[PDB]
């Protein structure tokens, strides 16, 4: 572990300090289909003519990124993504920008979002949830070892690749920080109490999120839900959680510690670090080495009739990609 990290941190640091820029152009890609949309940009399936490879291209509207004050966050996402490298993080292949947009081309995951399979199936068996949680556990140990905080863990951001393993996406809130940070961001159902009460938080918010995920993966629903955000936040800070009758005793115990409103006793942020999680009962059956190598039996293998298949993704209206004749936000995004 420590042997592995050390070297990994050295490869990251090099890239971190000298990020690669403009490694492609729009006209080298064939637009195929929008795979998701929202906030200030969208993600499209795309084909690279030189290699004939398919990629997921995230296009961000520079002007919209500015109206939503996400400039630094956006710079955080690309700089971090171009420098990291782990089996459960989706790979950033190319990045560039034009007059109107920012573009990040990444590896296309035909398998779709965990969210979709999770909602369709209802809930995962514990051995199934454990298999996915373990992968997240290792990704956070990797990330945190690099001083990175993820901040938006959820089924919607986890894709299943061809081997049934998870690929984390969306580094919009990722940030390299040593010490306390205060930015209010994330998704309601997953916000640590620290964030909602806006009291300066650290990596511990990621571990709390892992606790919400495991519960949702196993129960079929979030440990804290309601129609309006405010209602949800009152639940998160109450220090009250209920577990379906089917949750094993170890599973209940693991979650009690993970969903610990007392961030000075919450597993992961303790003296023993990630080992308080990796050496927990519910994980005793987990071969942590095996999982990193991907030699463990994947509980579910998504299906695709071929490369470029988008049946595992919903459909969205297809707007057009427009690049103004004038540069829009040069200075704000010069390092991208």
């Amino acid at each position: 572990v420590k042997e592995f990290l050390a070297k990994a941190k050295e490869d990251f640091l090099k890239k971190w300090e000298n990020p690669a820029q403009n490694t492609a152009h729009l006209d080298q890609f064939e637009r195929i289909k929008t795979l998701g949309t929202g906030s200030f940009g969208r993600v499209m399936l795309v084909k690279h003519m030189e290699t004939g490879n398919h990629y997921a291209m995230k296009i961000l509207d520079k002007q919209k990124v500015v109206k939503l004050k996400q400039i630094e966050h956006t710079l955080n996402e690309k700089r971090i993504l171009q420098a990291v490298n782990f089996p459960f993080l989706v790979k950033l292949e190319f990045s560039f920008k034009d007059n109107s947009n920012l573009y990040m081309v990444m590896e296309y995951v035909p398998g779709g979002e965990m969210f979709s399979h999770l909602r369709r199936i209802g809930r995962f068996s514990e051995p199934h949830a454990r298999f996915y949680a373990a992968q997240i556990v290792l990704t956070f140990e990797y990330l945190h070892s690099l001083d990175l905080i993820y901040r938006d863990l959820k089924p919607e951001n986890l894709l299943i690749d061809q081997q049934g393993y998870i690929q984390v996406t969306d580094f919009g809130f990722a940030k390299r920080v040593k010490g306390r940070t205060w930015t209010l961001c994330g998704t309601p159902e997953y916000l640590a109490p620290e964030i909602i009460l806006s009291k300066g938080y650290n990596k511990a918010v990621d571990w709390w999120a892992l606790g919400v995920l495991i519960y949702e993966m196993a129960a079929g629903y979030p440990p804290f839900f309601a129609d309006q955000p405010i209602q949800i936040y009152e639940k998160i800070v109450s220090g009250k959680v209920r577990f379906p009758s089917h949750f094993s005793s170890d599973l209940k115990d693991l979650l009690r510690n993970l969903l610990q409103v007392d961030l000075t006793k919450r597993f992961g942020n303790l003296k023993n670090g990630v080992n308080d999680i990796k050496n927990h009962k519910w994980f005793a059956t987990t071969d942590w080495i095996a999982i990193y190598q991907r030699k463990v039996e994947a509980p579910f293998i998504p299906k695709f009739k071929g490369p470029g298949d988008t049946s595992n993704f919903d459909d969205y209206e297809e707007e057009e990609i427009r690049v103004s004749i004038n540069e829009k936000c040069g200075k704000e995004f010069s390092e991208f």
């Binding site: 004050k69 969210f115 209802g122 919009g172 961001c185 994330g186 998704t187 129960a219 079929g220």
Partner: peptide, 20 residues
């Protein structure tokens, strides 16, 4: 059942991130 309350709630679709 909670599962029933969840499925009937307006929060079963993709949840948007928040910031400002």
């Amino acid at each position: 059942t909670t599962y029933a309350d969840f499925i009937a709630s307006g929060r079963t679709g993709r949840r948007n991130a928040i910031h400002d």
